[PDB]
Amino acid sequence: KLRNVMYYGDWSIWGGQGNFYPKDIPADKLTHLNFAFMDFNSSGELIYCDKDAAIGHPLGNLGVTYGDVNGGILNAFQVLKSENPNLKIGVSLGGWSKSGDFSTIAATPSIRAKFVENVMKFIKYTNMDFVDIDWEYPGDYREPDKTDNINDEGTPNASAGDKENYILLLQDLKEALNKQGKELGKVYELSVALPAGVSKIEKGIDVDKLFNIVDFANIMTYDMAGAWSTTSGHQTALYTNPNAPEEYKGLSVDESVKYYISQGAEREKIVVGAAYYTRGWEQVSDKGTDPNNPGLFGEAAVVNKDADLSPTPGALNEAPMKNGEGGRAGGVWGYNALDKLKSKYTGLKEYWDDSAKAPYLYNSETGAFFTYDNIRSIQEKAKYVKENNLGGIIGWMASQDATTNSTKRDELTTATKESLFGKEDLPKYEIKYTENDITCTVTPVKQSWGSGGVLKMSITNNEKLDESGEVLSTVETSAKTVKNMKVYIKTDGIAITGSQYPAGPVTKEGDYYVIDFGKISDGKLMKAGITFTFDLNLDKAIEDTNNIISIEVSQRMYQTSPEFNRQTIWEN
Ligand SMILES: O=S(=O)(O)CCN1CCN(CCS(=O)(=O)O)CC1
Ligand SMILES: O=S(=O)(O)CCN1CCN(CCS(=O)(=O)O)CC1
Ligand code: NA
Ligand code: NA
């Protein structure tokens, strides 16, 4: 079974990525959606990159106020899955900028165990389905590049022990996932992000052992050429053009996959990467390296400067170059910004390298050169996956895809899905939720005056908050809040004519009376430990509860989103 995997960065929601909220992800076209990234410290405690993004932002949902506990990307992912049950949702830990604490965690069994325990709790409270470990990279000594990213940790504590310790970490995670999956009655998966190139693999990836632990592995077959080099090239090519110079030999999807297989990787677990952005160079001279691809593998003149004044051959980026926030000139433009790119760099012509099956843009008069993925190269990558019995495709990243006919950013995502799977719907999966500890009492009220009767009902959220630290306490608080509660009451011969605050309004829907706490501002987010006690009005006085059959409750993340976790709280 193939996979169509997508990264979604938590910073998608701000202006740099055009304020792209999860509801506009084409989730019916994905099998796996990675929340990128969760940080963590050297003691194994999880740490947010952007707390408001993760747990507080309203994300375009009309009834959500900033900071409301049903806000945030993590809750939005749950809604995407409810609305698109083909989808598995998961969490990417680390990434290029937050891999600095892996070496320490992986080296000490007690810290490894704490990290694993915290990740298991996280995915329990967020109802996530997989864990993706993006250790970039084990055994690779690297300092931060604060000009690129003030928050970059690098991997300054890398060591030769990382290769074996990563295997231990992955083994611990998979065993914990197996255990928790059995406890909760669900299937979990474990994935990793892997380097494309041989030297990084040799430094830190025990291929054969790793592939026997993970469910699948995402090969980062992008960023394989760029402004760190003074030779133009393809950054994410399917095949190695035979004219490639030594520095780019090996750095294609095909050669990377073939190397992994030669080292023991199981084909069906290999997911290959597609980049939804350009890289490029300001001023490339055609050296005639490949006469059939002008400008390719040409010499890039060192004519620009980074934000820290370092000379560079890189072209300008879509975003302004600022020290500490995209400070390196890399020719980096989102796929959805190719029209902006062409307005800034005029005179670009589109080329296709038939030997690499990769597009590029080149101005033969100015020398500007950009390398990227398009619909055609993604279709070629998909054909390669199918013909070689590989595992799927991963895209980096969602917010960079282009709109087609709606507000969804889905041009490349749709092309990927249809080339892998065709036009039919993706398989759907059952979604399980853990019932909340919700109890209730019902008490007939003696009313010697007036007409009708009264039933006094109390509903209690018996959950209690135990987790410590910002990450686990916030996801726990959300999970143990009863959200937009609907109460379904089935009676035999008893009519509920009305309801009173703190109850929401009551209606008859089929054989049930339904109380909608989504319509009570004080009742729509019922925190742990809270009780609502309220009067229900009846058409006739009642002396016992014998004609009350059942009371059930359901939740909704938003007033608009699907009901879930329907559970019985009182039965006769
Ligand atoms: O200012 S914004 O909030 O728009 C972007 C903040 N920040 C910039 C750096 N990237 C690094 C991603 S990675 O290097 O870890 O892939 C994460 C987002
Ligand atoms: O002894 S050596 O290590 O030199 C060769 C071992 N060799 C590596 C390649 N795989 C192909 C797996 S697959 O093609 O069936 O997926 C077979 C075994
Ligand atoms: Na960290
Ligand atoms: Na193997």
Residues in contact with 32: Cβ distance below 8 Å, sequence separation at least 6, in sequence order: 3, 4, 5, 6, 87, 88, 89, 90, 130, 191
On whether both 45 and 187 belong to a single domain, the answer is yes
Residues in contact with 218: Cβ distance below 8 Å, sequence separation at least 6, in sequence order: 5, 132, 191, 192, 193, 194, 271, 273, 394
Cα separation, 231 vs 163, whole angstroms:
31
Contact (CB, 8 A) for 49 and 57: no
* Burial call 106-139: b when 16+ CB within 10 Å, e when fewer: bbeeebbebbbebbbbbbbbbbbbbbbbbbbbbb
Q: How far is CA 242 from CA 33, 233, 239, 246, in A?
A: 35, 12, 9, 10
C-alpha 264 to ligand 4 mean position (Å): 4
248: tokens are 């780019």
Beta strand segments in 264-348, E: 270-275, 279-281, 284-285, 299-300, 304-305, 311-312
Cα separation, 460 vs 553, whole angstroms:
12
Cα separation, 246 vs 413, whole angstroms:
33
On whether both 449 and 491 belong to a single domain, the answer is yes
Q: Identify the residue whose tokens are 């390398």.
A: 371
Secondary structure (DSSP) of 24-56: GS-GGG-SEEEEEEEEE-TTS-EEES-HHHHHT
448: tokens are 């010697």
Phi, psi of 435 (to 5 degrees): -60, 140
Contact (CB, 8 A) for 489 and 512: yes
141: tokens are 């000594």
Does 512 contact ligand 1 (Cβ within 6 A)? no
Q: Which ligand is nearest to the CA of 257?
A: 2
Q: Which amino acid is at 155?
A: T
Contact (CB, 8 A) for 190 and 174: yes
Contact (CB, 8 A) for 370 and 280: yes
Contact (CB, 8 A) for 305 and 316: no
Contact (CB, 8 A) for 459 and 37: no
Does 16 contact ligand 1 (Cβ within 6 A)? yes
Residues in contact with 141: Cβ distance below 8 Å, sequence separation at least 6, in sequence order: 155, 156, 158
Q: Which ligand is nearest to the CA of 211?
A: 4
On whether both 498 and 512 belong to a single domain, the answer is yes
Cis ω on the peptide bond leading into residue 502 (within 30° of 0)?
yes
Neighbours of 23 (CB within 10 A): 18
On whether both 156 and 79 belong to a single domain, the answer is yes
Q: What is the DSSP code (8-state) at residue 358?
A: E
Cα separation, 366 vs 349, whole angstroms:
12
Instruction: Name the nearest CA neighbour of 225 among 191, 242, 248.
Output: 248
Cα separation, 212 vs 219, whole angstroms:
16
Phi, psi of 201 (to 5 degrees): -65, -45
Q: How far is CA 87 from CA 17, 28, 29, 219, 402, in A?
A: 23, 7, 8, 21, 21
Q: Quick check: is 540 in a domain?
A: yes
Cα separation, 246 vs 252, whole angstroms:
13
On whether both 416 and 558 belong to a single domain, the answer is no
Q: Quick check: is 396 in a domain?
A: no
Strand order in the sheet with 506-509: 506-509, 512-516, 486-491, 548-555, 564-571
446: tokens are 């003696």
Q: Beta strand 496-499 with 486-491: parallel, antiparallel or unpaired?
A: unpaired
313: tokens are 């051959």
Q: Quick check: is 276 in a domain?
A: no
C-alpha 78 to ligand 3 mean position (Å): 25
Q: Quick check: is 339 in a domain?
A: no
Closest atom of ligand 1 relative to the 97 alpha carbon: 15
3-state secondary structure 468-519: CCHHHHHHHHHHCCEECCEEEEEECCCCEEEECCCCCCEEEECCEEEEEHHH
Does 325 contact ligand 1 (Cβ within 6 A)? yes
Cα separation, 335 vs 53, whole angstroms:
23
Question: How many helices (H) and strands (E) are present in the chain, helices listed first?
Answer: 12, 28
Contact (CB, 8 A) for 3 and 273: no
Contact (CB, 8 A) for 312 and 230: no
Residues 375/377/378/379 CA torsion (nearest 10 deg): 80
Q: Quick check: is 551 in a domain?
A: yes
Instruction: Name the nearest CA neighbour of 399 among 15, 4, 18.
Output: 18
Q: Which residues line ligand 2 (CB under 6 A)?
A: 261-262, 267
Overall residue count recorded for the chain in this entry: 572
Q: Quick check: is 8 in a domain?
A: yes
Experimental technique of record:
X-ray
On whether both 93 and 189 belong to a single domain, the answer is yes
Phi, psi of 55 (to 5 degrees): -135, -5
Grouping H, G, I as helix, E, B as strand and the rest as coil, residue 555 is strand
Query: Of 385, 415, 432, which closes a domain?
Result: 432
Cα separation, 14 vs 3, whole angstroms:
28
Residues 301/302/307/309 CA torsion (nearest 10 deg): -160
Total structural domains within the chain: 2
On whether both 410 and 462 belong to a single domain, the answer is no
Query: Of 432, 454, 486, which closes a domain?
Result: 432
Handedness of CA 294, 298, 303, 307 (dihedral sign): positive
C-alpha 390 to ligand 4 mean position (Å): 14
Query: Left, alpha or beta for 490 (phi > 0: left; psi -120 to 50: alpha)?
Result: beta
CA atoms within 13 A on the CB side of 181: 14
* Burial call 48-62: b when 16+ CB within 10 Å, e when fewer: bbbebbbbbbbbebe
Query: Of 414, 432, 450, which closes a domain?
Result: 432
Q: Which ligand is nearest to the CA of 270?
A: 2
Q: Which ligand is nearest to the CA of 217?
A: 4
- Which residues are near ligand 4, the ion (C-beta closer than 5 Å)? 208, 264
Contact (CB, 8 A) for 235 and 372: yes
Phi, psi of 11 (to 5 degrees): -85, 0
Cα separation, 272 vs 380, whole angstroms:
12
Handedness of CA 308, 312, 314, 316 (dihedral sign): positive
On whether both 413 and 557 belong to a single domain, the answer is no
Domain that holds residue 4: 1-220+402-432
Instruction: Name the nearest CA neighbour of 175 among 190, 165, 164.
Output: 190
Instruction: Name the nearest CA neighbour of 117 among 45, 170, 171.
Output: 45
Residues of the chain by 3-state class (helix, strand, coil), percent to 5: 25, 25, 45
Among 207, 211, 259, 262, which is best to mutate for testing ligand 2, by the most ligand atoms less than 8 A from CB? 262
Cα separation, 17 vs 36, whole angstroms:
14
Q: What is the CATH number of the domain that holds 448?
A: 2.60.40.290
Q: How far is CA 280 from CA 212, 332, 372, 378, in A?
A: 37, 7, 9, 19
Among 19, 96, 149, which is best to mutate for testing ligand 1, by the most ligand atoms less than 8 A from CB? 149
**Residues facing residue 318 across a β-bridge:** none
Q: What is the CATH number of the domain that holds 147?
A: 3.20.20.80
Cis ω on the peptide bond leading into residue 397 (within 30° of 0)?
yes
Q: Identify the residue whose tokens are 């990793």.
A: 192
CA-based Rg of the chain, rounded to a whole angstrom?
27
Helix axes 470-479, 73-83, angle to 10 degrees: 40
Q: Quick check: is 373 in a domain?
A: no
On whether both 92 and 138 belong to a single domain, the answer is yes
Cα separation, 245 vs 236, whole angstroms:
16
Taking the chain, what is the end-to-end CA distance rounded to the nearest angstrom?
Answer: 46
Cα separation, 467 vs 475, whole angstroms:
9
Q: Which amino acid is at 197?
A: G
Q: Which secondary structure element, helix H or strand E, spans residue 8, and what is its range?
A: strand 3-9
Does 96 contact ligand 1 (Cβ within 6 A)? yes
Q: Quick check: is 445 in a domain?
A: yes
Instruction: Name the nearest CA neighbour of 432 among 78, 31, 33.
Output: 78
On whether both 104 and 215 belong to a single domain, the answer is yes
Q: Identify the residue whose tokens are 């996280």.
A: 122
38: tokens are 């969760």
Residues in contact with 424: Cβ distance below 8 Å, sequence separation at least 6, in sequence order: none
Grouping H, G, I as helix, E, B as strand and the rest as coil, residue 401 is coil
On whether both 455 and 415 belong to a single domain, the answer is no
Grouping H, G, I as helix, E, B as strand and the rest as coil, residue 414 is helix
Q: Identify the residue whose tokens are 């709109």.
A: 403
Instruction: Name the nearest CA neighbour of 525 among 551, 557, 553.
Output: 557
On whether both 424 and 464 belong to a single domain, the answer is no
Grouping H, G, I as helix, E, B as strand and the rest as coil, residue 277 is strand
Instruction: Name the nearest CA neighbour of 395 among 367, 414, 408.
Output: 414
Cα separation, 503 vs 515, whole angstroms:
7
517: tokens are 């706490």
Query: Left, alpha or beta for 452 (phi > 0: left; psi -120 to 50: alpha)?
Result: left
Query: Left, alpha or beta for 510 (phi > 0: left; psi -120 to 50: alpha)?
Result: left
Q: Which secondary structure element, helix H or strand E, spans residue 124, and what is its range?
A: helix 109-125
